[PDB]
Structure formats: structure tokens, C-alpha cells
Design a protein around this ligand. Sequence first.
Ligand SMILES: Cc1cn([C@H]2C[C@H](O)[C@@H](COP(=O)(O)OP(=O)(O)OP(=O)(O)O)O2)c(=O)[nH]c1=O
Ligand SMILES: Cc1cn([C@H]2C[C@H](O)[C@@H](COP(=O)(O)OP(=O)(O)OP(=O)(O)O)O2)c(=O)[nH]c1=O
Ligand SMILES: Nc1nc2c(ncn2[C@@H]2O[C@H](COP(=O)(O)OP(=O)(O)O)[C@@H](O)[C@H]2O)c(=O)[nH]1
Ligand SMILES: Nc1nc2c(ncn2[C@@H]2O[C@H](COP(=O)(O)OP(=O)(O)O)[C@@H](O)[C@H]2O)c(=O)[nH]1
Ligand SMILES: [Mg+2]
Ligand SMILES: [Mg+2]
Lengths: 618, 627
Amino acid sequence: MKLSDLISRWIDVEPSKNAQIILRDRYFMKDLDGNYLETKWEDVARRVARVVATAELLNPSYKKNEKLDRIKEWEDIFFRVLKARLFIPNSPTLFNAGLGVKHDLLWKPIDQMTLEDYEEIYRSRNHLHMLSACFVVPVGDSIEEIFEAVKEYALITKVGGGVGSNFSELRPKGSFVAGTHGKASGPVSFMHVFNSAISVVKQGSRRRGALMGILNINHPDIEEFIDAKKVLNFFNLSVGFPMDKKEILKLYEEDGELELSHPRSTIRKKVKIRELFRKIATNAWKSGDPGLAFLGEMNKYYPLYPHRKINSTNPCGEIGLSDYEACNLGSIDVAKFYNNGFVDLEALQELVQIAVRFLDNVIDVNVFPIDKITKAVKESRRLGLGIMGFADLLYKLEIPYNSQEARDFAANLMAFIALHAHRTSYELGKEKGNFPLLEISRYRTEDNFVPFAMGMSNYDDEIREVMKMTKEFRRNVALLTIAPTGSISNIADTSSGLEPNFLLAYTRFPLLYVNQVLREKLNPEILKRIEKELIEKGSLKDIPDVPEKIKKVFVVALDIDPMDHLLMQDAFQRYVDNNISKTINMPQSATVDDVLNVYLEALRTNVRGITVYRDGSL
Amino acid sequence: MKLSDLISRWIDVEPSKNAQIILRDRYFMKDLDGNYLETKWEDVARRVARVVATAELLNPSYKKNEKLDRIKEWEDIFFRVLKARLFIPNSPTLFNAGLGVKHDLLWKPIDQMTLEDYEEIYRSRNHLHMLSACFVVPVGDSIEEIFEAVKEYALITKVGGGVGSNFSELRPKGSFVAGTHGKASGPVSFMHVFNSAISVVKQGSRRRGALMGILNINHPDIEEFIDAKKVLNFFNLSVGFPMDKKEILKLYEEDGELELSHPRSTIRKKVKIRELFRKIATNAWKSGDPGLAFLGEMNKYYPLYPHRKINSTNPCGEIGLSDYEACNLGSIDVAKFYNNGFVDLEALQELVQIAVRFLDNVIDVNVFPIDKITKAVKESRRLGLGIMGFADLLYKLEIPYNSQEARDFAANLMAFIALHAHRTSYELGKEKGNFPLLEISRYRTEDNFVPFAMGMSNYDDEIREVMKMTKEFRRNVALLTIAPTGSISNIADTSSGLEPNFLLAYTRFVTKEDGTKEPLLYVNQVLREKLNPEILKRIEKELIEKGSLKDIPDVPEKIKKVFVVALDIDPMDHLLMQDAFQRYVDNNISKTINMPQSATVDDVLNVYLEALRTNVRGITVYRDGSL
Ligand SMILES: Cc1cn([C@H]2C[C@H](O)[C@@H](COP(=O)(O)OP(=O)(O)OP(=O)(O)O)O2)c(=O)[nH]c1=O
Ligand SMILES: Cc1cn([C@H]2C[C@H](O)[C@@H](COP(=O)(O)OP(=O)(O)OP(=O)(O)O)O2)c(=O)[nH]c1=O
Ligand SMILES: Nc1nc2c(ncn2[C@@H]2O[C@H](COP(=O)(O)OP(=O)(O)O)[C@@H](O)[C@H]2O)c(=O)[nH]1
Ligand SMILES: Nc1nc2c(ncn2[C@@H]2O[C@H](COP(=O)(O)OP(=O)(O)O)[C@@H](O)[C@H]2O)c(=O)[nH]1
Ligand SMILES: [Mg+2]
Ligand SMILES: [Mg+2]
């Protein structure tokens, strides 16, 4: 079906009461005195679409004389997709689009818009007009650099961004400090200062700080780092693996030793890699931190490596970013593309093309707090297009999430999306200009460069042809992710990212969500029976009656075993150029060795990082 | 006697074994491998003298034909006074002088020095060559300004400076934040972040962070602030009074109210000033914090006010500084100037002269971490010349510290030092050029401006004359302080600043090798010389135990009266001695008002009230046994 007719299906479906509370609470724009300027999701869609359409003012392919018609056409299509909740950008785009701009321009009817109105919108965006969720900044090994970075953390946090750093440049605890003849405090002690700073800075009532701290497996303070969260309450922590995954897997299998060293310390030490891994797995088993960051695997597929390098991810791991790089995200609700036993690929291809342009346009109307970041974004134009609604889509297609069928479907769907996103990046490079760094990237300097592993779809040959075409034109260094969608999936009334539903019926903090696909499928009588027990047991697994069929389709996170979580992550990652947010859920009864086995399988798969969470742990 | 004759008396006297421990521990320079580059006090005096003499390269009054000779001469006199421990600069001058300079230049015989050698010393001073103890920075009401200040605190602490700020620009807790539609954390919450930063920064083993935080009495978060230290372990805290001390005393006497308010907040509150005072006194009675900072009184005597403004002190209260301003200090051991019943003013006047040139030269070879600081110091050239050994001097003169005799003597001594310091600033402005802001200062734009209150000396008229002469030539905006001298008085083997001796005797502990802790027994040297050694051996047990001579049987009354220690002296007598010095000091004064364990909160309040009537610029109290 044509997208415009899909839009018609969804556009007047009202957000749920629960989603409306969330919107009122933090997304509807208020004036300085606290009065609402927006009361409905329609108003947000209008505002955001108009602001992001103003980027077309910069399009060199439009004659000054045609610009108004073209801008209005993009506003209209952005508005309709957004109102329908077929695609939603990351929260900061929703919170901050239009800041600075006269209230009489942000919601005015589109048929009244003049070229001067759009110019005024573009000009009046203020210093807070920050629309991107993901940031990385370096923390160099000096007091100047550490405290400049603390300042950057605070500035990013204030405007609503999530920021990560690799702390491995900081010399280990005890190291000589030539300047004072002293002993260095080490990275962990400094991370405490970053945490203290972020305890007092937030985006008001809308968004607290969210941080990632990485320390590399071979740093002399790695053991202290691994136990650091056992304070650092604003940080997620992951262990960094800058080397090849294969090299580290081989070391483990051969029971080898890892040399812990640092370039500006005499502190050296040897540790058995198996012991280090067990220490990680033990802490993860207890508390869920730290995760693993396969930085080597990110750089393997980074088109600008090795003249730029990925040293860190943002807070939830989904984008690997070079120093001072930021990235804006957005997600398609693929559950809205179910049509009579199939995914409507006709309409999906159309939305992927719109979505890529929208995310690319956000770069042009985004304002960052630090010039180095503005520069890094402009040079690379990395985007993060992903999906949400995946688990609910599988429910509609009657596919169990824990099955090879599901995984082959996921690979093929992600492959389709990736083909069309990259084809769109080609078209935009031809239309608007290539990203500045194309010439020095592997898209240009190499043949047969592909930014992901592939191997699980018949789209692969077509994907290879497109990548060859982008030697010539390419708007964006990379285009895809799967994010947590912790808030936007709630706004869209759909499942989160690629995750299975955690529960089919449950209350969040008033009350209560109950899976609509299940409500629409399960016998409405055999439903009011079981319901009490389902909220009690948290699954259908051993409720009797309840058809087995409904049971096998309507699985939740803890019905699905750790390896089936992991292999789902791999199926998607083979067709994602950035990374993926995935929690490997594990039963309360899992052991430390069960965790280690997830790590070893992860090292063989194509995953770029790992997060585990053992039920009942925290 | 001539200063050269006094120098002869002291120059070959080495520091006590006690002082030598401190020096080896943190004053003797080491190479990157840790090997000692210095092993005698002599070696430190050579290095510092040579570095600071290097500033004479910039003296525009010298012809290059004499320049080597002139430089070598100041290096020589600097070396002799430092070696003798007659004058010693603040610790950071001693720790950092010569950093960046090739080791072959800092200690080689002076007769091997060429003008190329001095030029190279000047050129190779590195970014850690920081020679000043006292800093103030602003903390403006924005996330950007707050975290820029946090960084500044880390950079200053790294190089071994002590820093203060007034945090009153920060809007009170719960105030609107327009950029986020949020609520402000308030100053105290931010001060916790500064403390956290400084928990991980220090000048190696030499020196931990030392911070001052001031909040003004009409800030709406003042009550929270007053109780904040009852965490902030690197902060001293003082309450700021930017208004006239008289205005505050009058509000108190009338039992009036203060309106608390802030320019970036809508909430205002009225509080009884007596209630606020009792809150301060109760916390100080418990813990020693917060102090009082009479900012208004400091600005009363600030020659650049209101063009520039003192909003805060450094950590120990002794220098009131404008934003980004710093100040280098040094102190004269006046105990060494006793001669046969009198102070040797002949030799003291010559040393004042040398010392003011030394301190002014430090500015020229000092490297700061932040350009705005370099600028502020260059524009003002503020110095902090003070004294140590004062308590020991009184013992030698057989004057009780707790007496009008002592306070009269103090005022006269400080009046004399002030006279000849400001005279040498005149001579220096003529030789080297005036401080850039002389023009806009009250030394030019008024008649009869004097940067301190006077009123307790024969010298007042001559001081008035010197200040008039200084309308024309003046190298320095201000010259004088009395610091704590917590380390340099140890190196000099003398009493600390203007403070009385805390104890006349205690057990010192020496690391033996083998094991222990060899207990030695320290008795005050002047007491050792006056007291019959038979008696001393008899009473010293009891003297260590009781921490005073006062109730020891068969110690002569004259000895009891003269050899007083801090807790023998009542709080009013502490306070009035502070007033006597402050009348002839252009910056402020470090003084602890010691209070007996038996003092009440009412007794603390009465100290604060008497302080409002005297000429003191701030108050620190410590009640024995409170912490
Ligand atoms: C000064 C100082 C540094 N450090 C750590 C911070 C950085 O990780 C590292 C170096 O900081 P720096 O600020 O670089 O110290 P430096 O340049 O004077 O010494 P070097 O030439 O040997 O670099 O030392 C502390 O932990 N505490 C300190 O007091
Ligand atoms: C952003 C933010 C500010 N503050 C405090 C820091 C400053 O004392 C004060 C101002 O911060 P600013 O950084 O100046 O906030 P703003 O400029 O966006 O808003 P305004 O125009 O109202 O200044 O608020 C917090 O306590 N928490 C915060 O998250
Ligand atoms: N500062 C801050 N950033 C967050 C927070 N939650 C998410 N982010 C950022 O947004 C990214 C994507 O998270 P996602 O859950 O998809 O956000 P949504 O767009 O709000 O649904 C994270 O990886 C962070 O970079 C938060 O609470 N605070
Ligand atoms: N950073 C830091 N500064 C100090 C310390 N002790 C003193 N200061 C600074 O030195 C100034 C004068 O102190 P003083 O005790 O006379 O120092 P001394 O020269 O070491 O004897 C204080 O007022 C502070 O500003 C310390 O331990 N750390
Ligand atoms: Mg360094
Ligand atoms: Mg502001």
C-alpha cells in the first residue's frame, strides 16, 4: 500500500491515556510562566515538522523561487508521519525544537506560511536548540583536560544530552605526576568528580544526566573499575576492548595473559584474561555492570578509521562516536506496517526515505553548546535511524521471538531498511552535497567496503551494489541504530526497540498497560480468567488454558533464553552500521558461568557490545 | 647595629633538627628520579635568591654595563638574609622557584654567573613556576561560569596556591532557571562540587588544597550556609558583611531585622539579626566555623575601591583580594632583632627595605595558570610583608602578651614596619615605575587617604607624610599582612606570626630506625635561657601535663606573668592584640581568638560585638576542646 494510505489508517488514532500523561508531563511546550503552549500530540508534530522542514532553506538544488512550495511539501509529509506516530525522533528533538522562536510562528497554518516566516524560524533558534541524544567527548591525561571535560559534561547535561567518555587516557592510580612529584589519583577517582558535577546539573524536570564511562581491558586500574559500582549513580560502565574480538577470544581459549600497562605510568602487571572475565561476569551477575564494549569491532566497520577512531559509546551503547562527535536518532514503529500476514514493504521503503531526510535535516537546525562538536557533526553527518515495535510486529505475524524464524525475519527486515536508507543517503549526497569527509573514507579509498557483516539475507548483493554507488555520492557517514526507545516507544504506544515485551500486563510509575495485540487475539473470556495470575506470574508459560500457540507467540523477555536474546542481537547487527541497545535478560537461577558463556558466544557473533541483566539481581 | 652584623650572628646557625625534617620532607628540590638536588637549607636559599634576583634584568634604571654586577649584589643580599632565616617568603616561593630551569644554573658558584646565565633563567621558568600563596576567583551565576571556576580551583591547587571565593552571586536553592524551566541547586550544593574536585588535586605530597568560601549575611541561603559544616573538609567558611560594620552593630543594638534577598530570585525573608548572630556563634562555639569577614571594612581601606572591589579573602583571611587577584607573602623573624632590652630598629629598617624589593621582584618571575590572574597582579602589584617571632620577642623583652604594654609595643612596631615598607614602595615606584593603576587609586584622587586606621603610635604623622609622597610614586597598591606562618615559622625556629606560643613545651617524636619514636622534649628556647635549669627539670612534667605555668608551685611570679601561652590569655586580650596590629596593616591579619573550653555561646557573641567596635577586618574563633 502507498504510505499516504497507511498514514490515513493511523493519523487519527489518539495516543493512549498513558502516553498523554507522559506528553503533558514533559513534552508539551510551556512558556516562561509555566502555561501550556501545546495540549495535544498534534501540536508537537506541527512544531517539530515545521522546524525540521526549515532545513530545506539550505538545499542548493532548490531555486530561491521554488523554496516555499518545497519547504511546505516537506513540512506536510513530516507532520503527517509524526502525527500518525509511524516515525518519532529522539526526545531532545521533541523537547527543544522551536526554542527561541516566536510562538506565533511554530503552530501557524502551513497554507499561511511565507518564505520569510521560515527564514525567521531558522534565524531565531537559540543556544539551547539542541535536538540530539548522543555525545562523546575525550578526557585527556591532564588537570586542564579533565576539568574542561567536566565542564563539557555539565553543558551537555543542561541541554538534555547523554554523554560518554573513555577514561583510559588517565594514568593509573599511583602513577608519577612529574609536575608535582606526586601520585596520580587514577580514572576511577576522577569519574567520582564527574558524578558529583552531574548531581547538580539537569534539564530541569524533564531529563536528568545520563553518562557512560569506559575503561579499556588492559588499563592497570581495570580491576578497581570493574568493582567501582559495588557513588557513580549517573554512570553506566563498560569495559573497553580496542583489539579484535578474535584475538581476545583466542587469548581466553588458550588461557593466556594480558599485560596491563599505560604509556605515562611505570605501573605494569599481568593477569590471566580468564580471571578478569570472571571478575566482570561476577559483578554483572550481582548488579548488571559493567558491560562490554567491542571498540575494535566498531572501528572494523567505521568508514573513517584509522584516521579517526571510535573510543567510546554514548550511555546506552547504541552509537560508537569519535571524539566530540554527536548523533541524532529516530525510530520507525514497524508494528504499524503489519498488513494481512506481511510487512508492507511498499509503504516502509517510502517512510525510510522520508526518515533519512528528516534526520539529516535535524543536523542543520541543531545547535550544540561546544564548537568542536558542531564541527565533528558537520564533517560526518552520522545518523541513527532505527525501529521500535518489533516484538509487537512478531505478535501480529504469529512468530515467536525465540525462534530461528524470528531471527531470519529480523535480518531480512533490517537488511531491507539498511538498503533503502543507504540508497537515500546516495540520493541526498547527489542532491545536497556529500559529507565533507567522504573523500577520505573507506567508501572512496577502498573497494567492497560494507559497514556491517551481512550474511543473513538475500538482499546482500543489492546492498553491495549500493555501497559501491556511494563511492560517488553519500550524505552520511553512517545511518542506522537500534535504540532503547525508552520514552518514544511509550509515546507511540508500541514495544521498545528490538526488545521483547518485558510484560504482557503491568503498572508503571498511574497503572497499567496491557498488551493490545494480546487483547486483540486471545479469547476475551479466557483472558479475564488468567489475568490475575498473569500479573502475578509475569508470563503465560504455566498458566493452563490458554492455548499453546498463544503461549508460544506471546512470549515475554524472561520466557526467552539468554542465547535467543543474543542471537537476535546478532541478526540485527549484521545490517546496522552503528551499534544496538540490547539487554541480555537472564533468569534468577543463572550462574556466573552462564554469564561467561554469553560472553564467549558474543565474541563469536557479530555483536558490537553486551549488556546483561539477571532477574532479581538489584 | 648594622643589618650585616646581625646577619653575621645568624648566617652560620643551622636550622634545628625539627626544621630539617620539614625541609627534607617537602622543601628540598628533587630530580625526576627523586634524587635530592638540595640537602641543606643553604641550597634552597641559593636557588631562591638567584631566581628572584633575576627580576633585576627588567629594571629600567640599570645600564647594561652594571647589570651583571647589580644582579649579583641583590642575589648576594637575598641569599644572606634567607640563609640567616631573618626573612623567609611564603612556601610556594620556596617550593617552586627555579622550576623549568636547567639544574646547572640554579646552584653553581655565583662568581661563575654570566648575564647570559640570568637571561636563560628568566626564559626557562615553566608553567608551574608559581610563587604566590593567596588567590581569589569569582563564581558567576551560570553553569558555564561555575565549572570554569571549578577548573580554576584545580589549576591553582595543583601549583600550590590557596583560593577563595564569595559564592553569593549564585541564586538561592529553588530559584527559577529559565534555560531549563528548573529550580536552582543553590550555592552550598555547588560548594560541595568544588570540594569534590579538590579532594583529587594537590601539589603532590608538599601541600593539600586550602579553600575559602564566603556567603553574605543577606543571602537567602545564609542559615543553611551557617550550618553547612556541622563534606566541605577543604573549605574554611566565613560569613560576609559587605556593609559598614557600624551599620551592622546598630541593627544589632536595636534588635532589628535583615531582609534576605537575591537579584535573581523572587523570594524574600526577614530575619532578626540577633538570631542570625546567635546561629553563627553557636556553630562557631561547636566547630570553629563560620568566621566573620568584614568585607565593607576591607573596601574602606582598599585604594582601588569602587573601581575594583574586594569580595573575598584567601583561606586564612589575611589578604582581601579583588577578582582574579593574587598576592605573594613573606615574613620577618622579629625575635632575631632583640638587643639588650630593645628592638634593633637600625637593622630592622634595612631588612624591611630588602624584603619589600624581594617581594616585588617575585611578581616579575611568577607564572600564573590563568591569564586573567597575570593581568590583575601586573596591574596592582599587591604584596604581603609580615612578621613572625612576635611572641618570642615579647618573652625576651619581658613583656606579658596579655597586657596593654604589649599591645602598645605591637602597634609601635607594626607602625614602624609600615612606615618603612611604604617608603620603599615610593623609592621602587621611582626606580622601576608605578603600579599601572596608581592613577585611578585613592593615593592619587584623594588627599589624606591612609590604608589603615592608625591611632596607636608616635609614628602616625610621618606615616601620613609618606602616604602623601606616594600620590606621585608607588610600586605597590598595598604591602603588609600578618600571616599564620604555619610552615615558615617552623623553618625559622620561631613563634608563629603574631600568635602567642600555644605551648612552652611538649614531646617531639623522632623516627630512629631500629624502631620507635625517640621522645625528646622541646622546651621554648627563651624559657630555657631565663629559667633556672634546676627548676625547669623539676616542673617540666607538670608543665607538659597542664599546658601552662600558671598553677605550678614555686615558679616565680615574674616568669609566670611573662611566659604566657595562648590559653592563659583571655579572648578580649587576643582580640585587642589583633586590633593593635590591624591599625597599621593595609591588608588583613590572621588571628585565632582562642577561647577556654568553659566559654559559652554568649561569650562568643560578646567577642563578635567587641570586634564590631574595634578595627579588625575579620574574626576567627576556636574554643579549646570543641573539635
Ligand atoms: C596534579 C595532579 C595530577 N593528577 C593526575 C591528573 C592526570 O591524570 C595526570 C597528569 O596531570 P597534569 O595536570 O598533567 O600534571 P603535569 O603535566 O604537571 O605532570 P606530567 O608532566 O607528569 O603530566 O595526573 C592527579 O591525580 N592529581 C594531581 O594533583
Ligand atoms: C541548569 C542548571 C542551573 N543551576 C543554577 C546554576 C546557576 O546558579 C543558575 C543559572 O544557570 P544558567 O546556566 O545560567 O541557566 P540559564 O542561563 O539557562 O537560565 P537563566 O537565564 O535563568 O540564567 O542556576 C542549577 O542549579 N541546576 C541546573 O541544572
Ligand atoms: N541526559 C539524558 N540522556 C538520556 C536519557 N535517556 C536517554 N538518553 C539519551 O538518549 C539515548 C537514547 O535513549 P532512548 O531510550 O531511545 O531515548 P528516547 O528518545 O527518550 O526514547 C541514550 O543512549 C542517551 O544518549 C536521560 O534520562 N538523560
Ligand atoms: N593550597 C594550600 N595553601 C595553603 C596551605 N597552607 C597555607 N596555604 C596558603 O598560604 C597562605 C598563608 O599561610 P602560611 O601558613 O603563612 O604559609 P607558609 O608560607 O607555608 O608558612 C594561606 O593563607 C593560604 O592561602 C595548604 O596546605 N595548601
Ligand atoms: Mg600535564
Ligand atoms: Mg543563565
